[PDB]
Design a binder for this molecule. Sequence first.
Ligand SMILES: CCOc1cc(O[C@@H]2CCOC2)c(F)c([C@@H](Nc2ccc(C(=N)N)cc2)C(=O)O)c1
Ligand SMILES: [Ca+2]
Lengths: 53, 254
Amino acid sequence: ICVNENGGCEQYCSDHTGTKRSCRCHEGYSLLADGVSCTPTVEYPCGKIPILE
Amino acid sequence: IVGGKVCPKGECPWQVLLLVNGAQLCGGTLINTIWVVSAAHCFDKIKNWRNLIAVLGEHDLSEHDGDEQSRRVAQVIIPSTYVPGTTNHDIALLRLHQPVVLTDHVVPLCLPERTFSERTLAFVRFSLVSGWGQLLDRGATALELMVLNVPRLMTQDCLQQSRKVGDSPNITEYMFCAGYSDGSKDSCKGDSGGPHATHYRGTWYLTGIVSWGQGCATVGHFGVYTRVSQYIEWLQKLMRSEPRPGVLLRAPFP
Ligand SMILES: CCOc1cc(O[C@@H]2CCOC2)c(F)c([C@@H](Nc2ccc(C(=N)N)cc2)C(=O)O)c1
Ligand SMILES: [Ca+2]
């Protein structure tokens, strides 16, 4: 599933045995209850441009 | 950078400027508050490792505006497989002596997981390359940070689309091509070590390092970039390690 459309994950994806996958987020982010989206948890998360955010 | 534009101040906040005795050496990419990714080949001629400085929050080299942060480089880590004066395995991990302070003008680029980078980021067509390198082949370097959008090629396509140079280096699995063959747009030697940054779903990631090419924006040739995805596990392991005396460290690869 992770190889197809990133498994639906906004960031990182792991496959598990069975019809199972888990999305994960980089440090400075947390995964939302949709199980796919990542939201910053700190002021300067990686890969975002403050003056544009 | 040839054929790009000025990166508006603060819109390339992960860009690093490397200096040796105050002189421009190379670019780099901040990936957390103490770690910078650059190109191994930037260090082929270093005599005194203790005069290497990394600058974050830089924009216009002619002025000081207070957003700049300079740090000594405590460690330069190069893969065992890199041979000075050759092209393969062109990556360096630099530990700063003291962390930088994250601000609106200083922000790391995300170092992606390998699987994500190979499966997803590698298929994002356009990515940004940046630096204070030459604005023209055989021309002066830029005073303001420049950025350029370049498309990535599969290596077989790069080879088919490139003009042949008997001596040419091999494009290996630790490299990829990006850019244009019409002589209009490329990174250049002064951009060496800088980011090739790829956007996905609102966030930017490190996918390449400015590495080499035949001239800069030479008709029939593309830019060649270190394929960062090959080095994720190597980098992560080193970032978990304690510093060792002496700036240069050769570390086993894989
Ligand atoms: C591992 C680095 O290897 C380099 C090889 C270089 O030239 C050789 C001879 C012709 O093909 C390759 C080179 F100019 C450079 C040059 N860097 C460079 C970086 C990017 C480009 C480009 N995007 N066109 C060109 C040169 C430098 O730092 O001296 C580097
Ligand atoms: Ca400045």
